[PDB]
């Protein structure tokens, strides 16, 4: 709440109760390598 950004992208999807911790940079898995993948150089906040 003290900085501005060029643009903000909000991505919404649904997964199981697990692998929400897996949704992150790295942490190879089925969701990482075949579904929405988070880059290892990330600058955003994941909300679950």
């Amino acid at each position: 709440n003290d900085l501005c950004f060029t643009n903000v992208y909000a991505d919404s999807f649904v997964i199981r109760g697990d692998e929400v911790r897996q949704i992150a940079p790295g942490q190879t898995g089925k969701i990482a390598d075949y579904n929405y993948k988070l880059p290892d150089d990330f600058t955003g906040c994941v909300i679950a």
């Binding site: 940079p25 790295g26 190879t28 290892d40």
Partner: protein
């Protein structure tokens, strides 16, 4: 302190997010070695 002294061996067997830190440790070590070599060579060049 890296897992192995072989850059390609570190590249494989390791996921990129932590391969980055392993390669970074190796790069820091090798850069320190090169800096020490060139500094000693500068001393010897002054003497010569």
């Amino acid at each position: 302190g890296a897992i192995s002294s072989v850059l390609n061996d570190i590249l494989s067997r390791l996921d990129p997010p932590e391969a980055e830190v392993q390669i970074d440790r190796l790069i820091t070590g090798r850069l320190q070695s090169l800096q020490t070599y060139v500094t000693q060579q500068l001393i010897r060049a002054a003497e010569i």
